[PDB]
Design a protein around this ligand. Structure first.
Ligand SMILES: [Mg+2]
Ligand SMILES: [Mg+2]
Ligand SMILES: [Mg+2]
Ligand SMILES: [Mg+2]
Ligand SMILES: [Mn+2]
Ligand SMILES: [Mn+2]
Ligand SMILES: [Mn+2]
Ligand SMILES: [Mn+2]
Ligand SMILES: [Mn+2]
Ligand SMILES: [Mn+2]
Ligand SMILES: [Mn+2]
Ligand SMILES: [Mn+2]
Lengths: 440, 440, 440, 440
C-alpha cells in the first residue's frame, strides 16, 4: 500500500487548524550525511518533514502560512533543476513541477531562502520552528528574524513569539490513519516473512551475519530497500547484549539466536524479534526461559486495548516473570516482596513497549512511567525479554542466555490487531518450521 | 585475507619516520552518525584513523609522539569500559586491553582528553593535525593549545607549528603493501561474484532494486557486510544518469542495465561496473556502443603499467571513442580535429580512472590533469563509458543509452594485475552466461 | 538624583504583570569587553538588565518566575564571593547580600547556572528570552531547554513557547517615570555645563581634542564619569562629517566648531550639540545658516507636545529649511515643489529626533516614518542641522560648513520641558558668553 | 615624538627576514566593539597589527608574502572608500591612497578578501597566522585553506604548514628601537605630569574620581586622549584592593590614596603609581610602610641593568621587605627563615615588574619565574607595594593600608633610564609639593 497525495494535504491542514492566526510553520529537510570522504549514506528524510510532504530531497523547506482562520497557503523551498547536478548527483523535482506533484501553492529555489524567507515572516505574530533540530535550519531562521528585527526603518517586524511544533506534530504522528495502518500492516508482513526465512535458513556453522543477509534480501525483494534500524543477530552469549550489531560470530549447535530486525516500507518501520534454537530443537533450560517470555507476550496481547496503559500491562508482565523465575530457582522468596524489591531487574531491564511509526522508536508522549491511557490508532511494540548474564549467580543452565519475542500491534476500538503474527513464536511451531525446512 | 598487527605497527613507524623530532601527530576517530531520531547508521571508522589502528570505535584518538630520531611512543584515548553502556550500546575495548590488542604504549580515557592532551603537547615544537576534518577534533586541539599558550606562569608552552599530516598519510595510502593488495584482491573476487550473480538472476519484469538485493546478499555471504558505495542499477534511460541510485524501475526486455556495485572488505573497496542486456541478447545498436567502451577498457588494460599515466592512457581512449563514434555517424568530421574540439565530451564526461583503497575514490595526489607517472603498488579503476542522452541529436537507435565497463587493477613491476577479471565483459561471454543461467 | 530600590521593584512587577501565567523571563548581564590583550574597557552593563536591577556586574542573570496571576518570585544568578578574585579583579556582591541589596527572593552562583536553570524552567509553558542578544546567553538557554526536551524519562518538560521580552520591556523604557525624569534632568544640567565650559575655553590654536578634555572633566566633576557616546568636536570642514570623532585638528580663527557631547549619569544619557565660532564672532555667512537651524529648533520646541509626532514636526522643519535655503540662493525654485522633490536632502540628511534614555539612541517603537503620536513621559532629542559639503555646488561662502543645534526634551501633559536650555544657543548669547570669558 | 614610515617598513622587513621562503604572514585588525546598543567604544587597534602599519581602521588585513630570500611583497586588505559610510561612520583611507600612505605594494577591498586571499596563499608551503586571536580571522583563513585543499582539479594547493607568528613578533616588540624609546619617554613625561597634578589638586572631601578627572585631563591636553588602562584611585582601605577602579569614595583626611594611572601616547603605554597622604602629611605609621616600599624601588632602580633579571632583583626586594616588616613587628622571627617560608606573601602578592610597550602588560617571554637575563632595549615597570588588609593580624596602625610606588624604566648599555622620575616619590618632596600647591 502507499500514502496518498490527499493524505499529505490532510495532515498539513490538520497542523494549520491548530496554528494561531498570523503565523508560519517552518519544517526542514534532513541534511545529506557523509559515510567516508566524498561517499554518502543512503538518504533518509527527516520523519516530520516526510510526514507532511512525501518528498525525498535534502535542502528543502516546507513553509505553512496561516493568514487567519480561513486563509492559509503553502510555500516550498527546494533545489532548482540543473542538467549538470542531476546527470551527476541525480534528478531533481525543481520549482515548476513541485506545486502540482506535492500539492503546495508556491515553490521557490532553496538558494534564495535567505533573500525570501524573512519576507514570508514579516509582520506575523508567531513562527513555529523546531529549534536545535538542525544547525543549518537554526542559522536560516535566526538570520531571517535578525533582518526583521533590525529593519524597522524598512517597515519590517519580526514575530515576537516562537513555538516548537514538535509536541503538536508528534501528537498527530501518535495516532495512525487507516492508510498509515495499511502501510504498517504491510511492513509487518514483509518483516515477518524475513524472520520466517531466517529460521528456515539457519544451520550450525553459519555466521550470525549470514542471517542478516537473508533478512535484508527478503526486505528488498518486497520493495523495502533499507532496514528501519541496525539488525541484531545475537547467538549464544551475544543474546545478553541488547545493542549487539556486530553479528560476527559462528552460530553454534546448542545455542539460541535472538534476531531483531525490521524493514522500512514507505517510511514506516517494522520491528520484530524472534529467538530460536540454532539447531531447531529447544532444550529443557531454553524452553524454561522461553515459556516465561512467551506467556508474557501472549498475556500482553490479550490485555492491550483502549483503556489500559503500557505501565499497567508491564505490571502483569513483571508478575508473570518473577513467578516464572521463582519456580526455576533463579529468584528465591515471596513473589510479592520480590516484585516490590524489583528483583526481576537484573534479568528484565528493558521496557515492554514503545510507539512505532515513521521511526522505530516513535514520537509521542508516554506519560509519567508510561501511564498514558491507550486509545485506538496508537501503534506499539510488545517485547518482553529475559537476559541472564554469563556470570549471573543462577543455576548454571540459565547462564548466558538472551531471549526476546517482539510483535507489533495497533490498538483498535475493542482491543488490538497483531501486525506481525504471521511469523511463528510458539516453540512447537518454530521446531516444526525448522524441521520442515531441513528436508531441503 | 586480513591486515596484521605487525602491519599496523609498520604504518605508524613509517609516519613517525617522517615526523620532525619534538612533535606529536593527532589522529581522530569518526563520529557516530544519526540516521533518524535515536537511530544511527552502521558505524564507519574514519579511513586514516582505521589505517593506523584497525580499531572500530568512535571517541578515540591516536597520539604518536616523537621525542627525537630514536625515541617515540604511542598514546591512545578511547572510551572507558562500562557494564551499563555496553549491555546497551555494545561492548568496548577499554584501557586495559588496548595496549596489547592494538600495539600502543599507553591508553587513557577519552573523557579525560581535555585534562591530559595539553600535557602531551606541552613543550613540543610541532603538532601534526588535520584541521577542519571534524568539528569535535578541532575543538579539542584548539582547547589544548590555548591552555598551553595562556600558561607560561605554569611553565607551559604550545607548539608554534601545526602541520597537516594528510598529504603525508595519503601519499602512504597511495602505495599498497602486499597485505593490502591481498585484501583488495579478495574484495575484487567478492564484488565480481556479485556481478556474475546479478547477470544470472536478471529477467525482464524484475525491478532494478532486485539486482541490488542479489548483489548485497553476495557481498554479505563472503563476509563483506556493507557496500563501499551506494549501488547503481540503471536500466534503460536511467543508465544515462551517473549518480542513479533510486533503482526504482521495472527492468524492460530490450533495455540495457548498468550495474555499478562494490563491496567493502576489511575496510577496502571493490568497484566494478558491468552493463548488459536485460534479456540476455545484445542488439546491433547496443553492440555498436558496447564494443567501443570494451575496446577502450581492453586497450587501457594493455597500456597501464609503470611509466605511463592516467592522462596518457585517457588520450588513447579518447582516440578510440571518437573514431568509434565517427564510424557510427554519432560524430561527423576529422578524427583529429574532433579530438582537439573535445567533441567526445557530451558522451564521455567522466574520467577513466581513480585511485582505489580504503575509500572507493581513494586519497593520493593525481598531478595536474592526472599526469602523475604510475609506479608499482598504485591501485586504480579503469572505467570508460558512453552516455547518450534520450534527446541527444544522434541517430535514434543510440538515444537513451548508458554503458560503462569498470575493472580494478594494481600496477606491478612490469604492467598491471586485474583484480576483477573473474566477472565477464566480452559480449559473447555475457550472453553465454545469461543463456546458461536461463536453463534454471 | 538617583533611582530607588522601590522603583527597581516596580519595574520588575510591571513586567511580571504582562507575563503569561506559568512563565519565566530571563534577563542577562553584559559580557566584559577586551580593549587590548589582558586590558578591558570600563564595564557597561546591558541597559535592560540594568533597568531591572541597578546591578553593575557581569556574569549575572535575573530570572523572574510567574507561577500564576498572584504568585511570582525572582531568582538572581551572580558571581560568588572570593577573596582571591576580588583583591584582584575587584569586590563582588555574592549570594548572601544580594536578596536584600537588590530586592530579589533568591540568589544562586552563576557557576551553577547550567545545573540549576533547567530546574527553574521545568514544567513552565512559556519562557521569555531575547534571542541573539548575547552568544553566551543563547548557549545557556538552549542548553537548559535541550535537557528538558530530552528528559521525559526523568519527568522533565520544556516550555514549548519562547517570546522576545524586548518589545515589552522597550515599550516600558519609552515612558519615563518621575524618578527617571529627575535623573535625566540632572544629566541635562551636567551636559549643558560642559558645553558652556567648552565655549568659554575655546581659542584659536587649541586642538579639537582640547575641548573634548574640558567636557569630559566637567562630566566627571559632577559624578558622570563616562560619556554616553563618543564625543564629536568637528571644526571647519570636519563639521560636515556626522560621525567625526577623530577630533585631531587645530581649531582655526574663522571656522565654526560643532560639539556633540553627552554625559552618562546614573546610566541615563545626556545629548547636546552646540555649534559656535572658534573666534567668538559669527560671520554673515555663518549667521545665515545658523539662523535657519535655530529657527528650526525653536519652532520644534514650540510644537512638540502630546498629540503630534516626530514626522509632523519634521515636516515643519523641512519647510523652514527649504525657505531659508531658497532665500540664500542655495536652492532655486518653488518652495513647495522643492519640498516634494526632497531638495533639502543633500544638506539635511539626518532625522530631527530620537528617543533618549538609558541609551542615547533609546529603545522604543517609532511607527512608520516616525509617525507615532507623542504622549507624556516620552523623552527625545530635537536636533536640526545643515551640512554643506566642501565641494557643494552653492555660493562659495556656504561651502564646508556643518551646523547642528541639539536639545533634549520630555513631553509633558501640555507641551514639553527642555532639559538642556541652561546652555545658550541664540547667537548674541553665545558671543556674549565667549566675550565675557575672554576677559580671563 | 612619533613613529616614522621608515620604521614601520623596517619592522615588516625584520619579520620577513625570519619567515621561510614560499610563505605568507597574515595580520588582522581588531573588530569594532559595542559599548551599549548601536553605540561603540573608542576604537583600539590590535597592537601587533598596529606595530606593522600605524593604521587605525578595522576590517583590514596585512599580508606579507615571501617568494624567496630576496623577493617579497606586501598586500593590504582594507575598507573601500564610500561617500555614504564616511559622512556617517567617518573617513576611510581606501585602496588608492593606501600603497603610498602606508608603504605597501598593493591594496584590495576587504569585501573581496574571500575571493582574493586563497589566491595569495595558493602554492605556498607555509602560512603564518595567529590562530584563536579573532573569530572573524580564523573564519577567513580556514575558509581560504579549504578552497585550496578541495581544489586540486583547479590546480590549487594549500600550505600544509601553519605557524604562529606571535612568538616571533612579540620577541621583536620586547626590544624597543630608539624611536619607540623616544615615544615611551614622552608617555612617561605626560603620565608623570598627570600624577604631579593629582597630588597638587588633592584635598580632603574630594572624591577619588575627581583625581581621575584631573589625570585624564592632563593626558588629553598633551595629546594622549585615552588612558592605557583603567585608572585606579584607591583611598583608605580601597588601597588594599589591587583592581580598584570604582573610584567612588570620598577622600578622607588621615588616609593615603594610591593612584595608578597611565596615558596611551602614539599607542605606547605609560604606567605610574604614586601613593600619598590625602592631607599632604604622612603619619608615622604611613611613613613606616612607605619607607619600605620606597627603599625597594630605589634599590631596584640601582640594580636593574643588563645581566641581571626580574627574579634576581625581586629577591633583593623580598629581603628589604621582610626586614622592614620584622622591625615593625608585622612579622616575627628570623629574616632568612621567614623569606624561605615566603612569609611576606600576605602583604606583597604582586610581582615587581612587567614588560611595557604597546600594551601596558606587554608581550615578550619572561623565562621561568621571570629569570630571563635583561638586555638593552627592554622596557619594564618597577612597582613594589605593601598591602595590609583591614583585618590583618598586625598592629592596629598598619591595618587597611595599601601602598605602591611604580616607575617605568628602559635597560641601557650600562644600567637603566627612568622614564617617570619627573614625578616625585621621596616623602619630603611629596609633602613640599602638596604644601606649595595649598598656597593656591
Ligand atoms: Mg549454557
Ligand atoms: Mg532505444
Ligand atoms: Mg568658508
Ligand atoms: Mg588606620
Ligand atoms: Mn526490536
Ligand atoms: Mn522494539
Ligand atoms: Mn564504479
Ligand atoms: Mn570507479
Ligand atoms: Mn547628539
Ligand atoms: Mn542625538
Ligand atoms: Mn600600574
Ligand atoms: Mn604596572
Amino acid at each position: 500500500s502507499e500514502i496518498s497525495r490527499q493524505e499529505f494535504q490532510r495532515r498539513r491542514q490538520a497542523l494549520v487548524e491548530q496554528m494561531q492566526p498570523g503565523s508560519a510553520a517552518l519544517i526542514f529537510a534532513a541534511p545529506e550525511v557523509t559515510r567516508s570522504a566524498d561517499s554518502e549514506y543512503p538518504y533518509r528524510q527527516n520523519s516530520d518533514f516526510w510526514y507532511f510532504t512525501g518528498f525525498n530531497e535534502p535542502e528543502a523547506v516546507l513553509v505553512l502560512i496561516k493568514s487567519d482562520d480561513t486563509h492559509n497557503h503553502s510555500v516550498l523551498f527546494n533545489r532548482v533543476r540543473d542538467l549538470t547536478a542531476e546527470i551527476w548527483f541525480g534528478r531533481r523535482l525543481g520549482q515548476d513541477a513541485a506545486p502540482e506533484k506535492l500539492g503546495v501553492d508556491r515553490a521557490l529555489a532553496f538558494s534564495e531562502i535567505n533573500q525570501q524567507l524573512y519576507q514570508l515572516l514579516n509582520g506575523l505574530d508567531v513562527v513555529y520552528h523546531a529549534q536545535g533540530e538542525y544547525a543549518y535550519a537554526d542559522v536560516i531562521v535566526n538570520s531571517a528574524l535578525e533582518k526583521l528585527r533590525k529593519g524597522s526603518r524598512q517597515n519590517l517586524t519580526a514575530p515576537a513569539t516562537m513555538i516548537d511544533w514538535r509536541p503538536v506534530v508528534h501528537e498527530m504522528r501518535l495516532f495512525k490513519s487507516p492508510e498509515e495502518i495499511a502501510v504498517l500492516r504491510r511492513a509487518g508482513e514483509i518483516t515477518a516473512m524475513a524472520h520466517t526465512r531466517a529460521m528456515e535458513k539457519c544451520r550450525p556453522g553459519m555466521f550470525e551475519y549470514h542471517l542478516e543477509g537473508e533478512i535484508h534480501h527478503e526486505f528488498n525483494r518486497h520493495g523495502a530497500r533499507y532496514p528501519s534500524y541496525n539488525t541484531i543477530v545475537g547467538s549464544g552469549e551475544n543474546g545478553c547484549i541488547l545493542h549487539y550489531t556486530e553479528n560476527e560470530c559462528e552460530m553454534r549447535d546448542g545455542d539460541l539466536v535472538l534476531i531483531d530486525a525490521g524493514c522500512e516500507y514507505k517510511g514506516y518501520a517494522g520491528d520484530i524479534t524472534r529467538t530460536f534454537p540454532v539447531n531447531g530443537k529447544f532444550t529443557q533450560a531454553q524452553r524454561e526461559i522461553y515459556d516465561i517470555v512467551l506467556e508474557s507476550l501472549e498475556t500482553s496481547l490479550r490485555l492491550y486495548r483502549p483503556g489500559t496503559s503500557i505501565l499497567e500491562v508491564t505490571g502483569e508482565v513483571v508478575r508473570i516473570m518473577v513467578s516464572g523465575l521463582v519456580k526455576l530457582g533463579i529468584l528465591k522468596g515471596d513473589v510479592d516482596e520480590l516484585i516490590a524489591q524489583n528483583a526481576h531487574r537484573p534479568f528484565f531491564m528493558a521496557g515492554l513497549s514503545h510507539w512505532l511509526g515513521l521511526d522505530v522508536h516513535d514520537v509521542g508522549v508516554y506519560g509519567q512511567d508510561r501511564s498514558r491511557i491507550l486509545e485506538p490508532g496508537m501503534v506499539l511494540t510488545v517485547e518482553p525479554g529475559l537476559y541472564i548474564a554469563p556470570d549471573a549467580e543462577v543455576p548454571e543452565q540459565y547462564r548466558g542466555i538472551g531471549i526476546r519475542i517482539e510483535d507489533d500491534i495497533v490498538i483498535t476500538e475493542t482491543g488490538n490487531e497483531n501486525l506481525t503474527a504471521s511469523v511463528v513464536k510458539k516453540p512447537e511451531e518454530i521446531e516444526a518450521l525448522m524441521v520442515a525446512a531441513r528436508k531441503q
